[PDB]
């Protein structure tokens, strides 16, 4: 095991990382779990606030895609959010980054490359996040235990969908209160 200081969006730091991987044990797979939150309403979100959130998600994913063409990855996994699919309010830039990631897996599967985007629900185990947990609960998302979250990672490895949504939903609580989003209408 190695731990490396590397901003995955710094195309020179990542290239300097990959070049320093042993030749007898070449890279064969990637699990992308870099992420940054910086929340603000549409009328309030700034330019740097956008750049700051896309940088780990979109800017990094693209570098991993272009710096590894000389290697055929057996797995290439992208962590997204289910707020990209549902549209969690006050998180426009976060949704844009994670929506780019979802598509960038569909964009690799089209080319014949391994890829999967996982639009995660909410995990059981922080101020920028303590604001989001509030907004994912307001929409009926419930926390996924640590083991159960991993089990979905495992089982999703067996399914040939470029985009998959491991999530736990309190569908009854939205039907009760009448706040059912259109996307969820068939789960009642």
């Amino acid at each position: 095991v190695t731990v490396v200081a590397c901003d995955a969006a710094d195309r020179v730091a990542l290239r300097r990382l990959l070049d320093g991987i042993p030749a007898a044990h070449p890279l064969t797979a990637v699990v992308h779990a870099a992420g940054v939150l910086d929340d603000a309403t549409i009328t309030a979100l700034t330019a740097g606030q956008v750049d700051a959130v896309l940088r780990p998600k979109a800017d990094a994913v693209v570098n991993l895609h272009e710096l590894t063409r000389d290697r055929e990855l057996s797995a290439f996994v992208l962590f997204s959010s289910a707020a990209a699919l549902f549209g969690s309010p006050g998180q426009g830039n976060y949704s844009a980054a994670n929506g780019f990631v979802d598509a960038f897996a569909q964009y690799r599967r089209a080319q014949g490359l391994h890829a999967v985007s996982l639009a995660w629900g909410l995990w059981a185990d922080h101020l920028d996040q303590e604001g989001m947990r509030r907004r994912m609960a307001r929409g009926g998302v419930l926390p996924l235990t640590t083991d159960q979250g991993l089990a979905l990672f495992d089982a999703a490895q067996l399914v040939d969908e470029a985009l998959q949504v491991p999530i736990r939903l309190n569908v009854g609580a939205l039907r009760a209160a009448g706040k059912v989003p259109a996307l969820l209408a068939d789960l009642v």
């Binding site: 969006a9 549409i42 009328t43 330019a47 956008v50 896309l54 979109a58 800017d59 693209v62 055929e72 057996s74 990209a84 699919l85 549902f86 549209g87 969690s88 309010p89 998180q91 426009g92 830039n93 949704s95 844009a96 929506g99 780019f100 598509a103 960038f104 569909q106 964009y107 089209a110 629900g121 609960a137 307001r138 009926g140 419930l142 996924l144 235990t145 159960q148 979250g149 979905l152 089982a155 067996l158 399914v159 470029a162 949504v165 491991p166 736990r168 309190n170 569908v171 009854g172 609580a173 009760a176 209160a177 009448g178 706040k179 259109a182 996307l183 969820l184 209408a185 068939d186 789960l187």
Partner: protein, 676 residues
Amino acid sequence: HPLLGGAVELPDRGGHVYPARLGVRHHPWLGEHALLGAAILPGAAYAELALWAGRRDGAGRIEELTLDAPLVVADESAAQLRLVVGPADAEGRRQLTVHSRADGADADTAWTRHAQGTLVPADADAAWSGEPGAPWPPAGAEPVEVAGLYDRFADRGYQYGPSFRGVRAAWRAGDTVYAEVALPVPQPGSPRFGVHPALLDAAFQAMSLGAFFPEDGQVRMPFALRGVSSSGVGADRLRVTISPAGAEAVRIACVDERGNPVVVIDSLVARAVPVEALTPGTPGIPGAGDGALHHVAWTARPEPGVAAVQRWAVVGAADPGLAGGLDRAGGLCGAYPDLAALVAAVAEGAALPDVVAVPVPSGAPVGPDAVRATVLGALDLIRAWLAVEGRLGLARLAFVTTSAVAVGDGTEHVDPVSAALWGLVRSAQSEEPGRFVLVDLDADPASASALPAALAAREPQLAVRAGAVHVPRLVRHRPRPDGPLTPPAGAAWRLAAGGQGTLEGLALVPAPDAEAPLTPGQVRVAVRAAGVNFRDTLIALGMYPGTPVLGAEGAGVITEVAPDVAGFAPGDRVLGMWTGGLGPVAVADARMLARVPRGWSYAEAASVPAVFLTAHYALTRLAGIRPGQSLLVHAGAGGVGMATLQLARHLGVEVYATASRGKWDTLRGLGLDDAH
């Protein structure tokens, strides 16, 4: 007290502290009260605690009791609860707060506050007890259908376990409701409740048995209780009277079988349950027991029975072919270069459009630089649209992208850049509902013509494929005939003929003989790809139950090696010939292997063995062909045919060959004349 311990003294705030440890193993009924998938403590439980601790320290009446956020009961080792009693003020009144924190949690994690209220002295001398003889049920009360009530609560979200299901009869009488409740199981232990929180909640259940609440079909819990005096002691069966106190408040008066007033609530107010206020208890899964694997499903709409129309205003880069589709239906009111021009034209008397369309252009390079541009431009535009004054703002803002999503479960290409805008608006739709729409189009000009129909569909996001509108829906993943195969639970498995004689019968089946120990001369391969011969189709067909093994060839990475084998070691990329390679694990003979050339894909590698070995074995070892000889190759555009032509050109062979006249381009490209 069955739950609380001794009162712990408090000099600073002045007063007492009643501790209590909560656990389902200690009190199995603590979980048998649950709403919408969350096992929680009923509000009725906080009342028992208050009337008991309050009678002891003078303030036996509750002036007001407020509930802030419910306390969920998880699995064994539930959380401890503490009640605080305030000091006696100038009038004898004492404050109250209730708090809970997860069992064993650290001193640095804080406590959640669940209840606060105010207690007062009250004398029971005034109206101690009633008369034992008034006709109860009152004359003219309508019997209430109690049959199967517990199934009817469940359907709405009142998930009540064996301990609270005790409403056995009831009657409605105009404003008021009369009902009898009784604990399903009496409590046999000498630490007993005066009135079980289960029996009180059963009384609370009887509110939803009348018409006290709006017909909004949503679930309601106790939120605030005012003027609660309890007099008697030891009541397991009750007779409850409920009248409306005010317009939005009800008064509850329950007696024993003999008419002795046990408790009276001067006013209870219920309030709908925030969905926010839940954490999974997993009693009886009303949704998602432990979580599930979902995927979006684009499902095509039926062709609309009639032409649909809106007023349309196209603002910006008019993709060629788009305006033609909108104008067919007669909905195109104006083309404009930007929003600023539209705003002026309409103030100058142009048509107020139902829909303002914003054509997002494809072709952006898939890189960080163009994403910021696409986002920040949409961000600036949205902010411009919300500042639009007048009736023009009421129009829907339609972002019309090109292949920004994956409609079909195939290899559908996508534009990740546009899908970044798609996500920005995705959040914007929630912040400002009804303001924006997303409609994605393929490269078919026919789809531009379905765009009116798309916007005859109040869905917020939409996609059009070949002039057919699709709407997205999240869906729990499940196996499906007529769809992709699902590999078994094992790590090792392969593709195998089902024996029914059909391609539907192909199935991914466990393959233990791959995992098995190796004999000499063998290796085990973590297969990455495998080739397919036309013979492997014929095996999939044919109705004999015993069929040959599918697969002949492949490439992958070695995992184990027999001790006699040299020249291959764990970790080496290899291609070769082996049976049953249509799965992630295969055993192979080391003789029939080769190292994968630098720079090949596993697919390129796995394609080669069958075709070139057959063509090499035949040209060189069977026919012993020499330079200058002539060769005929039937089906030269096929698999083994192409391979034969490539070797034959290297061996100095004059090649003639046949193929379908449409494949002659493939032969003339392998270096053959129209005379050949």
